[PDB]
Amino acid sequence: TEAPKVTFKDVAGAEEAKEELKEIVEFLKNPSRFHEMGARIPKGVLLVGPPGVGKTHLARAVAGEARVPFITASGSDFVEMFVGVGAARVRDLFETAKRHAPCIVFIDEIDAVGRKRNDEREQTLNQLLVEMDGFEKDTAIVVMAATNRPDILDPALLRPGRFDRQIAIDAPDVKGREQILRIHARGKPLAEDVDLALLAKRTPGFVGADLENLLNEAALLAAREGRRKITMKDLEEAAS
């Protein structure tokens, strides 16, 4: 119902990607226009990249730049539910999404479903495939998923008509880094010498994971010494 609060303006970097998702955005705003023209869209987009680059953020950003709903689910939860239930819910997810088109359905950790872990997995994988093939030419709704290793994902998830469009996403740029830091740093008493702008400027190649431990780690070094604030030194030290 309520579109996200994130747009391509709040996503540092990923230029090459944002462009590719332009087409998807155009279709979620005017699904009738793309209908009239006799044009088709992939309807299955797998964002490819390493853990901690903000793939879900960009995904959520697509639903927001088109002011359309961002319906989410966890591929992992499904596989964790009694055999049959995980599938039942995949059935639900899409039956609800049909009722809120146009929209984006983000299946988180699609690797939980596509990668040979299992009765649950297989019943959840099968139900997802049918659901994605259960789409009509007039079905405004694009399914997005995220993964790091597309190679070992059941080939069926990638057959035309399903997740037949992939977009690579590299580690964040100095800004994407400054952002992740500023976030996690929330609730962490920093000293006056902490230059998060500079911290980001010197951790190239870092992913949201590396940038989250550095703070946590720098949090302990200071806690253990019983200091009330993380300083730029703790930060430099935590980095390695």
Ligand SMILES: Nc1ncnc2c1ncn2[C@@H]1O[C@H](COP(=O)(O)OP(=O)(O)NP(=O)(O)O)[C@@H](O)[C@H]1O
């Ligand atoms: N490129 C970026 N620009 C601005 N903020 C970002 C960026 N990448 C990540 N973030 C921030 O990190 C938070 C996590 O975003 P999310 O999409 O859930 O990424 P993730 O959980 O780190 N990793 P992934 O498994 O690759 O999706 C968001 O609240 C963002 O503010």
